[PDB]
Ligand binder design. Sequence first.
Ligand SMILES: COC(=O)N[C@H](C(=O)N[C@@H](Cc1ccccc1)[C@@H](O)CN(Cc1ccc(-c2ccccn2)cc1)NC(=O)[C@@H](NC(=O)OC)C(C)(C)C)C(C)(C)C
Lengths: 99, 99
Amino acid sequence: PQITLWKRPLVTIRIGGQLKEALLDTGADDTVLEEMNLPGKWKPKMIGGVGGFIKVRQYDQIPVEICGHKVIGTVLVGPTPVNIIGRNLLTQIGCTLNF
Amino acid sequence: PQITLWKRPLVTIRIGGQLKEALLDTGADDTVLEEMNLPGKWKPKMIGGVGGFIKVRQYDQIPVEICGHKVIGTVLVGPTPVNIIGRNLLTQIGCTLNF
Ligand SMILES: COC(=O)N[C@H](C(=O)N[C@@H](Cc1ccccc1)[C@@H](O)CN(Cc1ccc(-c2ccccn2)cc1)NC(=O)[C@@H](NC(=O)OC)C(C)(C)C)C(C)(C)C
């Protein structure tokens, strides 16, 4: 698809049994999801945005379905205002900015 | 051009004679520049990112040059860690997210 930017670029994603809305974010290095109890090992990290830092849990090698595209990578979980799909997963779906 | 997302989509912008590096950010409603002086009236605004809110100064109808494209719109100035080009100006350059 070709997504214009008059509205927030929100899509539905699937992570295990859970459907969520998430923002396609070219200004995010990383994918950050709202609080959820994913399986397996995690590492505590801090990530920075506008307004300062938040503490997140880093889970590696997590399958996520984004608009029917299957990706597998790193997901951070923490007190983000919105679910954010960052470049680490945008690159796995083949996303580019065009103008 | 087409910009891949392997690295941060940083581009050079020109504003009022000044060169700046800025991030093309589909996850930003607004364009927000690091602290700088601009002419004309402004008013305070609070904008929220992942780590909370910052207070910025809102300037309307500011011309910006982004990758050869002349745009005019609202620019927020304040304590952002990075210059951000948000959807208000991305729409003016006709940017789409493609995958
Ligand atoms: C290298 O660090 C990052 O990549 N940081 C990312 C990040 O914060 N990205 C910012 C751009 C950025 C990059 C580097 C340093 C600082 C900031 C944005 O891509 C995503 N972010 C994601 C975001 C989106 C919505 C909201 C929000 C806020 C209030 C109410 C509803 N939503 C908060 C954060 N958007 C905003 O913060 C924007 N906020 C905004 O559009 O609010 C409507 C601003 C910018 C206009 C302030 C994450 C923490 C998401 C990984």
